Amino acid sequence: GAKKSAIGQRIVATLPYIKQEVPIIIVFRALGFVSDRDILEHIIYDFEDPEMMEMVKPSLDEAFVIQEQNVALNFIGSRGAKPGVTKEKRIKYAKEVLQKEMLPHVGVSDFCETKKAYFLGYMVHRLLLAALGRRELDDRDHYGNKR
């Protein structure tokens, strides 16, 4: 597309109990990280790497409109499997989804958003390395990935 190939390749997230995926940056907005620098700090640990910074540009533009945590939570709640009757209930549902359903192994406590942002950023960071070719793709057959 004209503008489709200009921004590049954008990253989305398929969170549980959501019918349709959401932009990755939106999930960071919901977790409480609003500014781009705060979000990118959890994804790119070395700002001196121009290659990594470009990979996240299309993702930032996709979620440019959403600029507040409550706005982001409503967007996540709006796409929930059981959309809320009102906007306030949508935010509560989205908060519950991220609180327990998203990355539960990281934590389920009400104050684990920071830990979930780091791991989610690590998931994005790992994806960028695969996209950049810096790290080899995981092997399903590798038996240390099995239980």
Q: Which of 19, 37, 140, 142 binds other proteins (CB under 8 A)?
A: 37
Q: Which of 136, 138, 139, 141 binds other proteins (CB under 8 A)?
A: 136
The smaller minimum CB distance to other proteins, of residues 5 and 14, is found at 5
Closest CA to 9 of 56, 66, 52: 56
Contacts of residues 50-57 at CB distance under 8 Å and 24 or more positions apart, as own/partner, are 51/132, 52/125, 52/128, 52/132, 54/8, 55/8, 55/9, 55/128, 55/131, 55/132, 56/11, 56/124, 56/128, 57/7, 57/8
Residue 29 in contact with other proteins, rule: CB under 8 A? no
Tokens of 75: 């967007």
Site string for other proteins, 8-27 (x = CB under 8 A): --------------------
By CB under 8 A, name the binding residues for other proteins: 1-6, 32-38, 41-42, 45-47, 50-51, 53-54, 57, 60-62, 64-68, 70-71, 74-75, 87, 105-107, 109-115, 118-119, 122, 132-136, 143-144, 146-147
